[PDB]
């Protein structure tokens, strides 16, 4: 029944920074049966790092050492991009094995603006009798950013369900995909259908947009 | 080459039961003490149970009695028998190898989700979406339980793919993919989106033709 804490929760870091994430223990566990794992999102987790004791030249294996105490940490010496992660401590020194919570590791960029397109429904969906209006907003940078849907001009959000993608492990960007869905019938009410996209990198909105009976 | 690989994952009933299996190989088995793990959606690792070469098992508490461990060393496998499941059981699942007394968890398998919920399997609708660089997507909608595998041109299309986490609305998900490819390769050359959707047994294939 020994706990794992880890501190941060989470965490966001320059390329180049030295980062430490902490495992803090409710009582003692033994330096040899703390490990830690790293997990990208939607992978398995790998073995990350684990502490022992070494024997000098012509020791015998008889002997050996370790520590007792409730600190353990893991340490990036220079954070770069594809350490995106959330990494978990885990402890074998009591039963059951526990781990801590996770600390996610999110890295610190270049402001970047994003590239979007927008899709009309597609014939099949309509002769289903539905239609989503796709907008994608890919690769910017920091991940917060705000989108507006426009119809004929007047803003809509009535039918719009929004989903950001985990950081990239190599430019370390962020993309959304805004999905507008409305019945055919009510689709065919209204001409010009707009995605406005607001984003730090700049107060001019950038604006996808196309006309239903072009 | 030292693999482990799942099955047995999928949609099922609370108070209904499921049979996970995990498939060995390139190591000797019978070696190694063997562990479960398993992973709420959103959430952190979590050990569920272990079974010594020795065949000794142990089981988080709160799964005692519910779950059963075991293996067959014959056929290089490990089980995990589920009965009783509830709501909280719902989870990636991952078989592990132990290094030593087990604890060290070197090898994982890459996890075969289990849902449990009385809503019931529905095949995703795949839809096509059509419009230097051309971006083109997939729409998958309408589906339940998780998850989907979305590839491009059966997976020779890797680059330039962003594949968005499905958001759940009335009990069905949805999900969209874009690819990012040369003006020159589309419509010059097929690109289609391959959907598998296992728990319906859905598999589709939906070619992007432009529009007219």
């Known amino acids: 029944q020994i706990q794992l804490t880890q501190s941060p929760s989470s965490l966001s870091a320059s390329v180049g920074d030295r980062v430490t994430i902490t495992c803090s223990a409710s009582?003692?566990?033994?330096?040899?049966?703390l490990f830690w794992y790293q997990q990208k999102p939607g992978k398995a987790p790998k073995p990350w790092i684990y502490l022992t004791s070494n024997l000098a030249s012509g020791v015998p294996s008889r002997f050996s050492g370790s520590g007792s105490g409730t600190d353990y940490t893991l340490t990036i010496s220079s954070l770069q991009p594809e350490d995106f992660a959330t990494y978990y401590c885990?402890?074998?020194?009591?039963?059951?094995?526990?781990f801590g919570q996770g600390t996610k590791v999110e890295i610190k960029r270049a402001d970047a603006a994003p590239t979007v397109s927008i899709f009309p429904p597609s014939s099949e969906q309509l002769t289903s009798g539905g239609a989503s209006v796709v907008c994608f907003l890919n690769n910017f940078y920091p991940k917060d950013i705000n989108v507006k849907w426009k119809i004929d001009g007047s803003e809509r959000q009535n039918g719009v369900l929004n989903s950001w993608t985990d950081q990239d492990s190599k430019d370390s960007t962020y993309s959304m995909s805004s999905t507008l869905t409305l019945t055919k019938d009510e689709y065919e009410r209204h001409n010009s259908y707009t995605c406005e996209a607001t984003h730090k990198t700049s107060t001019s909105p950038i604006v996808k947009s196309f006309n239903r009976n072009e | 080459e030292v693999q482990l690989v799942e099955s047995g994952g999928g949609l099922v009933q609370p108070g209904g039961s499921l049979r996970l299996s995990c498939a060995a190989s390139?190591?000797?088995?019978?070696?190694?003490?063997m562990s479960w793990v398993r992973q709420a959606p959103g959430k952190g690792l979590e050990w569920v149970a272990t079974i010594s070469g020795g065949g000794h098992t142990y089981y988080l508490d709160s799964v005692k009695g519910r779950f059963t461990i075991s293996r067959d060393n014959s056929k290089n496998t490990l089980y995990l028998q589920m009965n009783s499941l509830r709501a909280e059981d719902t989870a990636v699942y991952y078989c592990t190898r132990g290094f030593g007394d087990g604890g060290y968890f070197d090898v994982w398998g890459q996890g075969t989700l289990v849902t449990v919920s009385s809503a019931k399997t529905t095949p995703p609708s795949v839809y096509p979406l059509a419009p230097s660089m051309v971006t083109l997507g997939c729409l998958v909608k309408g589906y339940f339980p998780e998850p989907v595998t979305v590839t491009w041109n059966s997976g020779s299309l890797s680059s330039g793919v962003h594949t968005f986490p499905a958001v759940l609305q009335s009990d069905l998900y949805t999900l969209s993919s874009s690819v990012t490819v040369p003006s020159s390769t589309w419509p010059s050359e097929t690109v289609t989106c391959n959907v598998a959707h296992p728990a319906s047994s859905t598999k589709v294939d939906k070619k992007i033709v432009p529009r007219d």
């Open positions: 390139g190591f000797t088995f019978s070696r190694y003490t």
């Open positions: 009582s003692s566990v033994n330096s040899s049966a």
């Open positions: 885990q402890q074998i020194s009591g039963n059951p094995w526990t």
